């Protein structure tokens, strides 16, 4: 996984890819101020698949 | 398989802009049958928002 800084649209396309079929739910608030403000891995990314 | 899995990507991409600060929930079941098949504008997606 690319071990980058996920931020505005780049963050919601990297969950619809790790999340596939299931779905997502994005909120503009732990997901940001970690994924984004910091750098998430694939496990931390699928906390957010519904 | 393709076709819908295209699709969404082009409207969490959408969903993103329109729903802003609200987020939104992705479930590729109500939503790909409405819009990728025919065109849903902005006004559309926001039923989609938190
Ligand atoms: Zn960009
Ligand atoms: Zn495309």
Same mark, same amino acid.
């Given at each position: /996984?690319? #071990?980058?800084? &996920? ?5 919601? @396309?990297?969950?619809? &890819?790790?999340?596939? @079929?299931?779905?997502? /739910? ?6 940001? @101020? ?7 891995? &694939?496990?931390?990314?699928? #906390?957010?698949?519904?």
């Amino acid at each position: /996984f690319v #071990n980058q800084h &996920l931020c505005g649209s780049h963050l919601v @396309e990297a969950l619809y &890819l790790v999340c596939g @079929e299931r779905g997502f /739910f994005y909120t503009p608030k732990g997901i940001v @101020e970690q994924c984004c403000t910091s750098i998430c891995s &694939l496990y931390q990314l699928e #906390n957010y698949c519904n």
